[PDB]
């Protein structure tokens, strides 16, 4: 049908049809008379998987023969979404499969909707890992993703009476055709026990053993025949476990609970024992596998850093540092100093937030009981590190306190960020402003001691999933003008600046957006029975629910627009559909109240006859990767409105830019670099800068001042307090009003006036479709910097010491 | 190589080789350079499985079109063993696969050893279900086996310091290529709750729900292209289960524990709640599936018994009776009397033991809490049943007490056997003597009320697994004389009586036995580093460890032989290898002490220089179906020595007869019918008959009398007491001596003299190889009655009301 989706040759279609029929018969054990759409999905998935296997085997054989430096990306989260379409895209099979299924009387897009998301992450950090795997394969790096195979991923969100309800994400119920169990490579992991000192060093004895069983998933590069591996570990009890008899067998569940469920916290630290067990489990199994592969290569650990790089995705796998030391010192019998040199040169650390509540600080008493040898190693690392600090800054006693890996107080804790900096040769933030804030504030002391360690690597997104897959219409009109090479070299989108006055292109860009909006408007009615006006401006804020992300500021603007309409009903206003979506962590009360507020506003606004279809407020239920793929291409306006200095980068912002939405945002995270690329005239920037926030903090933030001086804001607060949005429960939102008025860490009121004014400027431009679209073209054209291919090429060259390759492996 | 294993045609071998290579590549994702023997096993299993699928689909399509009466065999146990060789045998693929693998440089028998047993049963009852499934498919019956998919089957037994240790049987660790998950046919099962009475009948409300997910395994008939289904249910929590958040997800384990593990009790009742849950889980899911299939056929439940038969394998699935009533009365709104008519005509019950401790008697308080509606139904069944008893036997108040389904006392209990008799149109024992004992003793009252219900169906074994598969050498020499038809018509073995004086045949029968013994002697050295003399008489007792089975009587004979050798070292004795094997239930202390005794005797006997290789005592570790397939063909002497009236049938006895061992046994269970078939002169019968046991009981059994009058027995008891077999722990066996002397329910001493004398007669015949073999031929020749094909044909005609068919389905 469309060019970017590849060829549908007679030979290929014929083979696909026959292999589809083979899988339905032999693999699924069904005939066409009894088969359901789900059976048809599985027959297609197995057919596509077959095309991966030869390339997968020969890629791994290639790495064994060539023996390049291997990259190990360690993460507790991989937010992969669906696999079928992505695999077809990267193998150039989409048009052929579309034709083959069409000829069998089936609709492929209907089959695609059957697949469960692999929802093994919370949000930005987990999705970053997923985009990174795609880019590493596309750039021919010998890269492996290592994590945990959670039985239950991020919960499914249902909205009941306007409230979030959580349901278990039983994603494996129908099986997972993509993974291959590798029970043959099962490895033991140790917990508890005690340390014995011999004349020949320390021994960790009397431990409990849990087995780590790997499952491998293929990661295809874009049309280069490279297939890398994501290896996820699953917890299993040994067979002599607890071995009255019945209870001992039932108690195996205790061991196997380690890989049962993803902790659903986004940017927040909960010091639970089970979470610590998960973090050690992934680190211990992964490091054994790395060492095994290194020894089987082609005794000398001096060359270890030449053949191995380990990237820590936040501090979650920080135990890799003392675990590597443990193995090298206790088991391989290296001297401390040599082991430490190897460790530092091997490990690098990526920081994802500056919010104090998100930082992992583990109580010493937990580590003492669970990982006694690791605590001893951490103490020794600390002692040697502080000795270097003391030598560099003699007499500076407070610096010693500030830099210690051990935090003193009521409960003694280990600061895992400090451990990561001490034990890594590179430390990076994830956008230019964030990386600067790290050096100036939270890690200033460390930057002074070791300036060479600190780097920036601005985040990116993969243009395969986030353009070609989710927005084929836009990909096609681009390819029609500039060819297909931009898909793996996104900087080529700059060539589109030559078409900003091209009447044909302007029309085509606008047509694709309208189609996407029509498709999404239909999706909503079909799946949720919710009506929307497809001619309205689609104003979208989708991301996890957090106070710092300021969904509440968006709510205030919505109520402002409603109040203005009620004041002057017969005045023209640009019609809007305001869509907000995202999950709240189950224990985060304020985030749950914010969801209730949004639905409560919708309940009033959507049923007011005077408003008509000029304003609609919709909460998008169960926001996840598959839903992002639908809503992002349909958006007109991207809301990126975090308080300056709080969102480290953002990546949702980049997805919207690539897909033809304009951005309203603060100068926060990557928004700064996006505006710099596109030009500030082509962005809707408002609000306090970081320096303005610092000034307000010095003075003291007083929310009452804003309430007193802004009558429109006063009205809204009075409406919330009095029960206008909750007539049955008049004091429902009192916690929200109280926080806003007395305890607001994120200064919602301070940006309100500038936000409302900026929103007026958005409505003004939307009234002029031609000029709206020209600004859109200027955004798409300068989105190239934000490809994760750029990001990974920078990690490769500046941290890992390897060169990317766009060259094909033989098919 | 050999005829009975089928053809190895060039076309077939070529196809098998290519499909083997395809599975290794695409299914296993391996190349030949990295593949292990386990990978090779899986490639072969998938290749053979492919041959099953077409026949499986078309068999089930055939039943839908023809709509015959369906047979549902309900069992908590299916002791299936390995599947690969059985599948090849029944499909006539063994020689072709042997050739194909040979050409790929692989040894098929080595690959076969990799497969885990499906050990989903304890012993005789579970293995009977497995032989039955094979016979039902071979006889073309539309039959379905329904049970539980235990994650952990019968434990693996390890012997450590002479003691039994138990290890979890993690049989699914590497996957199960034979099963197909059917998550689409998942059904809800209800527990707890309460009963509400409406104007329109009872309602069971406020229940907890557990999901039952089916897994289907193919059951191939012998060379008839029929493939039936065994459907096993697995427990899953609903997704809103317990839905702080983390704990609710972890607590799903509580629901899913229902299908976690097989209770390892053989002939013993433990009234645990989890076991009751298992019994209801299988019954509730199965009955819904039966009703669904009945409605989808081709409203009228009058024809239900014409289209459905349910066979209860013991009382374990007895809840089918009140569950069927519940569905018909509460949900389908039938009147009680009509529902009861349908229930009785649908259900039939097989009893497997008369031992009082094995009978299921559930405390009323358990049923009250777990299954409140079922208890109400059971009370109503009881009331109506006792009303009929009162009318038939007016004034007989004690009969009313004896026949009640409700047992009065300290703890009120429901007698499940009484429930089964009341609610079934047929009740059968499993051998002629057992069926007679039921009518004369434990169910006398019921037999008086309803004589027409009581039947006999003597047990049998499948000659596919228990001759062709495990003993191809014997199968081949038989086929050479009489053709191949006997494999599905075992009565044809009578034709062998014409060869009892044939010198060629006599030589061939003896040669096959020697080869089997050589193979087994080698297996022992290879796998267990244990040496045995292959020229000795192989004296074998393999079965679960129980006091009634009298492994202890065997032990006494062994010690007698040792003592006689020590007394007269230079006298000739026929050399023996005495092998005893079997598992003990983990909570059964005496059974564990018996295992220790056997190993302790071996420790003395096997290292006494004076004995030499004239006597060896070996405990066979981890007795299971796969081990039975090895040891049975190697045996010379089969020990079947239960106290008369205690072993209902036995089936191990029949396996030994078919494979060319002679039998030493009591007149118990099927031993009686075996001796009747072969002729008493061709059996080694000894000991008390049932009538002799009854006489001794009336008088009172005094073990001291035997100890006082038999000097050789006194010596043994004195050796056990004094610590001769446990020098480090002199009083180790005091519990055994005490039981024997004061509390022996099974009268070990009473049969000792006759047993020892009979054993002398065995040694006498073994000295004459030609006459030994002629007696063997007379046993094999008359083993035909003991085919499970005969047994199933009798169930079909006399209970289920269906005709068997030996006719082929089109391939
Ligand atoms: O902070 C935690 N978890 C975080 C932290 C940051 N992030 C996000 O990472 C993205 C990728 O770099 C950035 O674009 C965003 F700016 C950042 O907010 C995220 O998605 N989860 C956390 C802490 C303790 C326990 C669990 C999670
Ligand atoms: O009695 C129980 N479980 C039994 C009972 C009898 N049997 C056996 O069944 C074989 C097949 O008919 C016969 O050949 C044997 F004679 C008989 O002993 C057996 O293998 N398990 C039991 C009771 C409560 C709980 C669990 C098991």
mmCIF file of N, CA and C in Angstrom, chain A residues 558-646:
data_model
loop_
_atom_site.group_PDB
_atom_site.id
_atom_site.type_symbol
_atom_site.label_atom_id
_atom_site.label_comp_id
_atom_site.label_asym_id
_atom_site.label_seq_id
_atom_site.Cartn_x
_atom_site.Cartn_y
_atom_site.Cartn_z
ATOM 1 N N UNK A 558 -7.944 24.632 32.436
ATOM 2 C CA UNK A 558 -9.210 24.076 31.972
ATOM 3 C C UNK A 558 -10.408 24.782 32.627
ATOM 4 N N UNK A 559 -10.368 24.913 33.953
ATOM 5 C CA UNK A 559 -11.433 25.592 34.712
ATOM 6 C C UNK A 559 -11.549 27.080 34.346
ATOM 7 N N UNK A 560 -10.413 27.732 34.097
ATOM 8 C CA UNK A 560 -10.389 29.112 33.597
ATOM 9 C C UNK A 560 -11.188 29.249 32.287
ATOM 10 N N UNK A 561 -10.935 28.340 31.346
ATOM 11 C CA UNK A 561 -11.628 28.334 30.054
ATOM 12 C C UNK A 561 -13.131 28.102 30.207
ATOM 13 N N UNK A 562 -13.497 27.140 31.051
ATOM 14 C CA UNK A 562 -14.890 26.909 31.394
ATOM 15 C C UNK A 562 -15.557 28.168 31.986
ATOM 16 N N UNK A 563 -14.919 28.778 32.984
ATOM 17 C CA UNK A 563 -15.475 29.987 33.619
ATOM 18 C C UNK A 563 -15.657 31.168 32.658
ATOM 19 N N UNK A 564 -14.695 31.352 31.758
ATOM 20 C CA UNK A 564 -14.761 32.400 30.742
ATOM 21 C C UNK A 564 -15.917 32.171 29.766
ATOM 22 N N UNK A 565 -16.145 30.912 29.393
ATOM 23 C CA UNK A 565 -17.282 30.560 28.533
ATOM 24 C C UNK A 565 -18.604 30.874 29.236
ATOM 25 N N UNK A 566 -18.733 30.446 30.488
ATOM 26 C CA UNK A 566 -19.942 30.712 31.275
ATOM 27 C C UNK A 566 -20.199 32.211 31.467
ATOM 28 N N UNK A 567 -19.121 32.989 31.558
ATOM 29 C CA UNK A 567 -19.220 34.442 31.683
ATOM 30 C C UNK A 567 -19.719 35.099 30.397
ATOM 31 N N UNK A 568 -19.169 34.673 29.259
ATOM 32 C CA UNK A 568 -19.543 35.215 27.948
ATOM 33 C C UNK A 568 -19.868 34.092 26.956
ATOM 34 N N UNK A 569 -21.059 33.477 27.097
ATOM 35 C CA UNK A 569 -21.413 32.262 26.350
ATOM 36 C C UNK A 569 -21.420 32.448 24.834
ATOM 37 N N UNK A 570 -21.711 33.661 24.375
ATOM 38 C CA UNK A 570 -21.909 33.890 22.943
ATOM 39 C C UNK A 570 -20.689 34.463 22.227
ATOM 40 N N UNK A 571 -19.551 34.456 22.915
ATOM 41 C CA UNK A 571 -18.272 34.826 22.315
ATOM 42 C C UNK A 571 -17.625 33.593 21.682
ATOM 43 N N UNK A 572 -16.981 33.776 20.533
ATOM 44 C CA UNK A 572 -16.265 32.680 19.894
ATOM 45 C C UNK A 572 -14.975 32.341 20.639
ATOM 46 N N UNK A 573 -14.771 31.043 20.845
ATOM 47 C CA UNK A 573 -13.507 30.513 21.353
ATOM 48 C C UNK A 573 -13.082 29.338 20.477
ATOM 49 N N UNK A 574 -11.774 29.177 20.296
ATOM 50 C CA UNK A 574 -11.239 28.020 19.591
ATOM 51 C C UNK A 574 -11.594 26.772 20.402
ATOM 52 N N UNK A 575 -12.306 25.810 19.776
ATOM 53 C CA UNK A 575 -12.725 24.587 20.457
ATOM 54 C C UNK A 575 -11.529 23.708 20.808
ATOM 55 N N UNK A 576 -11.563 23.109 21.998
ATOM 56 C CA UNK A 576 -10.476 22.233 22.446
ATOM 57 C C UNK A 576 -11.008 20.927 22.966
ATOM 58 N N UNK A 577 -10.241 19.865 22.731
ATOM 59 C CA UNK A 577 -10.394 18.611 23.462
ATOM 60 C C UNK A 577 -9.149 18.486 24.318
ATOM 61 N N UNK A 578 -9.348 18.565 25.625
ATOM 62 C CA UNK A 578 -8.248 18.468 26.568
ATOM 63 C C UNK A 578 -8.201 17.027 27.070
ATOM 64 N N UNK A 579 -7.101 16.345 26.774
ATOM 65 C CA UNK A 579 -6.904 14.957 27.163
ATOM 66 C C UNK A 579 -5.739 14.837 28.143
ATOM 67 N N UNK A 580 -6.005 14.216 29.284
ATOM 68 C CA UNK A 580 -4.975 13.988 30.293
ATOM 69 C C UNK A 580 -4.982 12.497 30.587
ATOM 70 N N UNK A 581 -3.802 11.894 30.650
ATOM 71 C CA UNK A 581 -3.710 10.474 30.989
ATOM 72 C C UNK A 581 -2.419 10.157 31.707
ATOM 73 N N UNK A 582 -2.420 9.050 32.448
ATOM 74 C CA UNK A 582 -1.227 8.601 33.153
ATOM 75 C C UNK A 582 -1.626 7.849 34.406
ATOM 76 N N UNK A 583 -0.742 6.974 34.870
ATOM 77 C CA UNK A 583 -1.011 6.199 36.074
ATOM 78 C C UNK A 583 -0.419 6.879 37.299
ATOM 79 N N UNK A 584 -1.069 6.661 38.440
ATOM 80 C CA UNK A 584 -0.573 7.093 39.745
ATOM 81 C C UNK A 584 -0.044 5.881 40.508
ATOM 82 N N UNK A 585 1.080 6.038 41.198
ATOM 83 C CA UNK A 585 1.569 4.970 42.068
ATOM 84 C C UNK A 585 0.492 4.675 43.117
ATOM 85 N N UNK A 586 0.184 3.384 43.352
ATOM 86 C CA UNK A 586 -0.914 2.990 44.242
ATOM 87 C C UNK A 586 -0.884 3.624 45.636
ATOM 88 N N UNK A 587 0.300 3.935 46.163
ATOM 89 C CA UNK A 587 0.396 4.540 47.506
ATOM 90 C C UNK A 587 0.488 6.062 47.582
ATOM 91 N N UNK A 588 0.374 6.725 46.433
ATOM 92 C CA UNK A 588 0.589 8.163 46.315
ATOM 93 C C UNK A 588 -0.769 8.860 46.327
ATOM 94 N N UNK A 589 -1.212 9.240 47.524
ATOM 95 C CA UNK A 589 -2.545 9.811 47.741
ATOM 96 C C UNK A 589 -2.853 11.045 46.885
ATOM 97 N N UNK A 590 -1.944 12.013 46.869
ATOM 98 C CA UNK A 590 -2.180 13.252 46.125
ATOM 99 C C UNK A 590 -2.367 12.981 44.624
ATOM 100 N N UNK A 591 -1.565 12.072 44.069
ATOM 101 C CA UNK A 591 -1.695 11.688 42.657
ATOM 102 C C UNK A 591 -3.057 11.050 42.361
ATOM 103 N N UNK A 592 -3.574 10.287 43.319
ATOM 104 C CA UNK A 592 -4.902 9.698 43.171
ATOM 105 C C UNK A 592 -6.015 10.743 43.242
ATOM 106 N N UNK A 593 -5.824 11.759 44.084
ATOM 107 C CA UNK A 593 -6.768 12.875 44.190
ATOM 108 C C UNK A 593 -6.800 13.735 42.923
ATOM 109 N N UNK A 594 -5.639 13.880 42.284
ATOM 110 C CA UNK A 594 -5.507 14.624 41.020
ATOM 111 C C UNK A 594 -6.297 13.935 39.893
ATOM 112 N N UNK A 595 -6.207 12.607 39.815
ATOM 113 C CA UNK A 595 -7.007 11.849 38.843
ATOM 114 C C UNK A 595 -8.497 12.085 39.097
ATOM 115 N N UNK A 596 -8.919 11.973 40.357
ATOM 116 C CA UNK A 596 -10.323 12.219 40.701
ATOM 117 C C UNK A 596 -10.750 13.633 40.289
ATOM 118 N N UNK A 597 -9.901 14.628 40.544
ATOM 119 C CA UNK A 597 -10.191 16.020 40.157
ATOM 120 C C UNK A 597 -10.454 16.152 38.656
ATOM 121 N N UNK A 598 -9.587 15.542 37.847
ATOM 122 C CA UNK A 598 -9.712 15.616 36.380
ATOM 123 C C UNK A 598 -11.046 15.059 35.890
ATOM 124 N N UNK A 599 -11.420 13.885 36.388
ATOM 125 C CA UNK A 599 -12.693 13.274 36.007
ATOM 126 C C UNK A 599 -13.873 14.121 36.497
ATOM 127 N N UNK A 600 -13.731 14.706 37.691
ATOM 128 C CA UNK A 600 -14.764 15.559 38.287
ATOM 129 C C UNK A 600 -15.021 16.826 37.470
ATOM 130 N N UNK A 601 -13.952 17.429 36.954
ATOM 131 C CA UNK A 601 -14.049 18.565 36.033
ATOM 132 C C UNK A 601 -14.775 18.155 34.742
ATOM 133 N N UNK A 602 -14.400 17.001 34.188
ATOM 134 C CA UNK A 602 -15.062 16.443 33.002
ATOM 135 C C UNK A 602 -16.553 16.228 33.212
ATOM 136 N N UNK A 603 -16.912 15.713 34.385
ATOM 137 C CA UNK A 603 -18.313 15.514 34.762
ATOM 138 C C UNK A 603 -19.152 16.797 34.685
ATOM 139 N N UNK A 604 -18.575 17.926 35.089
ATOM 140 C CA UNK A 604 -19.246 19.229 34.986
ATOM 141 C C UNK A 604 -19.203 19.782 33.556
ATOM 142 N N UNK A 605 -17.998 19.865 32.995
ATOM 143 C CA UNK A 605 -17.770 20.531 31.708
ATOM 144 C C UNK A 605 -18.449 19.821 30.539
ATOM 145 N N UNK A 606 -18.372 18.493 30.524
ATOM 146 C CA UNK A 606 -18.829 17.716 29.377
ATOM 147 C C UNK A 606 -20.358 17.637 29.282
ATOM 148 N N UNK A 607 -21.051 18.008 30.355
ATOM 149 C CA UNK A 607 -22.516 17.947 30.368
ATOM 150 C C UNK A 607 -23.212 19.307 30.516
ATOM 151 N N UNK A 608 -22.448 20.388 30.367
ATOM 152 C CA UNK A 608 -22.998 21.739 30.429
ATOM 153 C C UNK A 608 -23.488 22.152 29.036
ATOM 154 N N UNK A 609 -24.815 22.360 28.882
ATOM 155 C CA UNK A 609 -25.396 22.629 27.553
ATOM 156 C C UNK A 609 -24.855 23.914 26.923
ATOM 157 N N UNK A 610 -24.498 24.883 27.758
ATOM 158 C CA UNK A 610 -23.995 26.170 27.290
ATOM 159 C C UNK A 610 -22.613 26.046 26.635
ATOM 160 N N UNK A 611 -21.814 25.088 27.111
ATOM 161 C CA UNK A 611 -20.471 24.862 26.570
ATOM 162 C C UNK A 611 -20.545 24.249 25.178
ATOM 163 N N UNK A 612 -21.484 23.322 24.990
ATOM 164 C CA UNK A 612 -21.665 22.648 23.705
ATOM 165 C C UNK A 612 -20.495 21.729 23.449
ATOM 166 N N UNK A 613 -19.955 21.763 22.236
ATOM 167 C CA UNK A 613 -18.755 20.986 21.940
ATOM 168 C C UNK A 613 -17.534 21.895 21.775
ATOM 169 N N UNK A 614 -17.565 23.033 22.460
ATOM 170 C CA UNK A 614 -16.450 23.974 22.426
ATOM 171 C C UNK A 614 -15.339 23.575 23.401
ATOM 172 N N UNK A 615 -15.693 22.778 24.407
ATOM 173 C CA UNK A 615 -14.716 22.301 25.390
ATOM 174 C C UNK A 615 -15.079 20.915 25.911
ATOM 175 N N UNK A 616 -14.116 20.002 25.816
ATOM 176 C CA UNK A 616 -14.251 18.650 26.348
ATOM 177 C C UNK A 616 -13.011 18.287 27.159
ATOM 178 N N UNK A 617 -13.226 17.614 28.285
ATOM 179 C CA UNK A 617 -12.129 17.154 29.141
ATOM 180 C C UNK A 617 -12.259 15.648 29.309
ATOM 181 N N UNK A 618 -11.230 14.932 28.867
ATOM 182 C CA UNK A 618 -11.236 13.474 28.834
ATOM 183 C C UNK A 618 -10.034 12.951 29.616
ATOM 184 N N UNK A 619 -10.266 12.006 30.526
ATOM 185 C CA UNK A 619 -9.147 11.287 31.129
ATOM 186 C C UNK A 619 -8.885 9.998 30.347
ATOM 187 N N UNK A 620 -7.670 9.862 29.822
ATOM 188 C CA UNK A 620 -7.297 8.705 29.020
ATOM 189 C C UNK A 620 -6.849 7.548 29.906
ATOM 190 N N UNK A 621 -7.693 6.527 29.974
ATOM 191 C CA UNK A 621 -7.531 5.391 30.871
ATOM 192 C C UNK A 621 -6.407 4.467 30.410
ATOM 193 N N UNK A 622 -5.628 3.956 31.367
ATOM 194 C CA UNK A 622 -4.605 2.931 31.114
ATOM 195 C C UNK A 622 -3.491 3.339 30.132
ATOM 196 N N UNK A 623 -2.967 4.554 30.303
ATOM 197 C CA UNK A 623 -1.863 5.038 29.483
ATOM 198 C C UNK A 623 -0.666 4.096 29.581
ATOM 199 N N UNK A 624 -0.172 3.675 28.417
ATOM 200 C CA UNK A 624 0.884 2.686 28.301
ATOM 201 C C UNK A 624 1.473 2.867 26.899
ATOM 202 N N UNK A 625 2.509 2.102 26.569
ATOM 203 C CA UNK A 625 3.206 2.283 25.281
ATOM 204 C C UNK A 625 2.241 2.170 24.089
ATOM 205 N N UNK A 626 1.393 1.141 24.066
ATOM 206 C CA UNK A 626 0.446 0.971 22.944
ATOM 207 C C UNK A 626 -0.520 2.138 22.779
ATOM 208 N N UNK A 627 -0.953 2.714 23.897
ATOM 209 C CA UNK A 627 -1.814 3.887 23.834
ATOM 210 C C UNK A 627 -1.067 5.146 23.368
ATOM 211 N N UNK A 628 0.182 5.312 23.810
ATOM 212 C CA UNK A 628 1.037 6.420 23.349
ATOM 213 C C UNK A 628 1.171 6.409 21.816
ATOM 214 N N UNK A 629 1.313 5.215 21.253
ATOM 215 C CA UNK A 629 1.430 5.058 19.797
ATOM 216 C C UNK A 629 0.199 5.544 19.034
ATOM 217 N N UNK A 630 -0.949 5.560 19.706
ATOM 218 C CA UNK A 630 -2.210 6.028 19.120
ATOM 219 C C UNK A 630 -2.463 7.533 19.336
ATOM 220 N N UNK A 631 -2.247 8.008 20.557
ATOM 221 C CA UNK A 631 -2.590 9.390 20.898
ATOM 222 C C UNK A 631 -1.548 10.407 20.412
ATOM 223 N N UNK A 632 -0.267 10.052 20.474
ATOM 224 C CA UNK A 632 0.779 11.002 20.095
ATOM 225 C C UNK A 632 0.620 11.507 18.636
ATOM 226 N N UNK A 633 0.455 10.600 17.644
ATOM 227 C CA UNK A 633 0.242 11.081 16.256
ATOM 228 C C UNK A 633 -1.006 11.947 16.053
ATOM 229 N N UNK A 634 -1.961 11.856 16.974
ATOM 230 C CA UNK A 634 -3.208 12.611 16.896
ATOM 231 C C UNK A 634 -3.162 13.993 17.575
ATOM 232 N N UNK A 635 -2.087 14.284 18.296
ATOM 233 C CA UNK A 635 -2.028 15.496 19.128
ATOM 234 C C UNK A 635 -1.705 16.772 18.343
ATOM 235 N N UNK A 636 -2.344 17.872 18.733
ATOM 236 C CA UNK A 636 -1.998 19.198 18.219
ATOM 237 C C UNK A 636 -1.052 19.937 19.155
ATOM 238 N N UNK A 637 -1.296 19.797 20.455
ATOM 239 C CA UNK A 637 -0.570 20.543 21.472
ATOM 240 C C UNK A 637 -0.032 19.589 22.530
ATOM 241 N N UNK A 638 1.274 19.665 22.765
ATOM 242 C CA UNK A 638 1.983 18.837 23.743
ATOM 243 C C UNK A 638 2.253 19.650 25.019
ATOM 244 N N UNK A 639 1.716 19.186 26.145
ATOM 245 C CA UNK A 639 1.855 19.882 27.436
ATOM 246 C C UNK A 639 3.068 19.359 28.183
ATOM 247 N N UNK A 640 4.073 20.218 28.345
ATOM 248 C CA UNK A 640 5.328 19.830 28.999
ATOM 249 C C UNK A 640 5.685 20.894 30.040
ATOM 250 N N UNK A 641 4.995 20.844 31.171
ATOM 251 C CA UNK A 641 4.842 22.021 32.018
ATOM 252 C C UNK A 641 5.355 21.829 33.451
ATOM 253 N N UNK A 642 6.347 20.955 33.600
ATOM 254 C CA UNK A 642 7.015 20.719 34.884
ATOM 255 C C UNK A 642 7.642 22.030 35.410
ATOM 256 N N UNK A 643 7.725 22.179 36.727
ATOM 257 C CA UNK A 643 8.422 23.327 37.324
ATOM 258 C C UNK A 643 9.879 23.293 36.885
ATOM 259 N N UNK A 644 10.401 24.437 36.444
ATOM 260 C CA UNK A 644 11.792 24.505 35.989
ATOM 261 C C UNK A 644 12.750 23.877 37.007
ATOM 262 N N UNK A 645 13.608 22.978 36.520
ATOM 263 C CA UNK A 645 14.620 22.302 37.337
ATOM 264 C C UNK A 645 14.201 20.945 37.898
ATOM 265 N N UNK A 646 13.003 20.473 37.550
ATOM 266 C CA UNK A 646 12.492 19.220 38.143
ATOM 267 C C UNK A 646 12.443 18.008 37.207
#
